Ligand binder design. Structure first.
Ligand SMILES: Cc1cn([C@H]2C[C@H](O)[C@@H](COP(=O)(O)NP(=O)(O)OP(=O)(O)O)O2)c(=O)[nH]c1=O
Ligand SMILES: [Mg+2]
Ligand SMILES: [Mg+2]
Ligand code: NA
Ligand code: NA
Length: 321
DNA sequence: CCGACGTCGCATCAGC
DNA sequence: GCTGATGCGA
DNA sequence: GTCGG
């Protein structure tokens, strides 16, 4: 409904992040963009938008200019700037951030071709990102995601039937499509007060050719790439997968957070504060009278957390906000 | 006016 | 060689 | 860039 405006702002967001290296202005512009994307009227003036939490004066002027002229001078100029449009563009390769993109572009390396003639100046992560540049900007239909889930749960269980594994993120909320697969993994032998538990699982998903590459991997977090096996039909795009190993006592705080949504997590956490509780990704802790969080409270399911702060347990179907 | 604005695991660099 | 800092993604 | 202490 204000796509013209929310695109304008989303473009501005990226340049701040990618060219100006001003992460907070990026987030500001995104916040503005979100709040407007939900406003159910066609905006008529910058003054009208300025009412929304997150649209201040400078953005209200931009909207004014945009509504009157159909463009923004600053955006027009920057879009056409050889250096800046190039720095902004190379950041689309996973693993190249604004700092690596600046350096390339400084040494003349501007395009995906340029990257392709310079593999040796790229780290491992960045090469996988180049390799799969296209696939990484595709969404994943739920149908494939269910096929992916099948594989992960089968293979996890087959390594050791006592592992618990939950596919979280936009998939667990019932979205028709996902941008990646986030897997949360625990095992009764692993608690906070507690050692190749993640490795054996990556091992097995590699063994059956589900996991095809590795961005990064430690004792707790796996970041890599995976692909469904090819059915006649054309093969499946490579997909981003993360696998996290969480201690059992923090596992459900984990599930809940990595289930989201963003906005839902904000509310729930705010609410929980006003009920005298502190929730992070790991633990819910009781705020005392001066405001000192004491020991973490025992959690054994999701619903537990909801009880604690007296909220009606939420089916993830309804965790939009 | 002027500081907060998410926090953290992992890879890899800069410094010693 | 080790330790902390920075970049990156999410 | 926006907000708020
Ligand atoms: C990025 C982000 C994620 N989260 C939580 C909620 C997300 O649903 C969950 C996974 O994040 P995601 O993979 O970036 N977004 P998504 O999985 O809900 O949907 P998709 O990956 O865009 O398809 O992590 C936050 O609580 N704050 C954040 O800033
Ligand atoms: Mg800057
Ligand atoms: Mg996701
Ligand atoms: Na305002
Ligand atoms: Na990038």
């Amino acid at each position: 409904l204000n796509g013209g405006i929310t695109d304008m702002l989303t473009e501005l967001a990226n340049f701040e992040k990618n060219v100006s290296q001003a992460i907070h202005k990026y987030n500001a512009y995104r916040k503005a963009a979100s709040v407007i994307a939900k406003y159910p009227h066609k905006i008529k003036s910058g003054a009208e938008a300025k009412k929304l939490p997150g649209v201040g004066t400078k953005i209200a002027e931009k909207i004014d200019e945009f509504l009157a002229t159909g463009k923004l001078r600053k955006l027009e100029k920057i879009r056409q700037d050889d250096t800046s449009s190039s720095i902004n563009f190379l950041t689309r390769v996973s693993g190249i951030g604004p700092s690596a993109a600046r350096k390339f572009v400084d040494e003349g390396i501007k395009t995906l071709e340029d990257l392709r003639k310079n593999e040796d100046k790229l780290n491992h992560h960045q090469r996988i990102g180049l390799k799969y540049f296209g696939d990484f900007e595709k969404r994943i239909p739920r149908e494939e995601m269910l096929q992916m889930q099948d594989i992960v749960l089968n293979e996890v269980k087959k390594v050791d039937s006592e592992y618990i594994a939950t596919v979280c993120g936009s998939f667990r909320r019932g979205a028709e499509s996902s941008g990646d697969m986030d897997v949360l993994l625990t095992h009764p032998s692993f608690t906070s007060e507690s050692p190749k538990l993640l490795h054996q699982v990556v091992e097995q998903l590699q063994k059956v050719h589900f996991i095809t590459d590795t961005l990064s991997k430690g004792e707790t977090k796996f970041m890599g790439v995976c692909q469904l096996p090819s059915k006649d039909e054309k093969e499946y795009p490579h997909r981003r997968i993360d696998i996290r190993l969480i201690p059992k006592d923090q596992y459900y705080c984990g599930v809940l957070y990595f289930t989201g949504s963003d906005i839902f997590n904000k509310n729930m956490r705010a609410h929980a504060l006003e009920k005298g509780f502190t929730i992070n990704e790991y633990t819910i802790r009781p705020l005392g009278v001066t405001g000192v969080a004491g020991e973490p409270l025992p959690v054994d399911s999701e619903k537990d957390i909801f009880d604690y702060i007296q909220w009606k347990y939420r089916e993830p179907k309804d965790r939009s906000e």
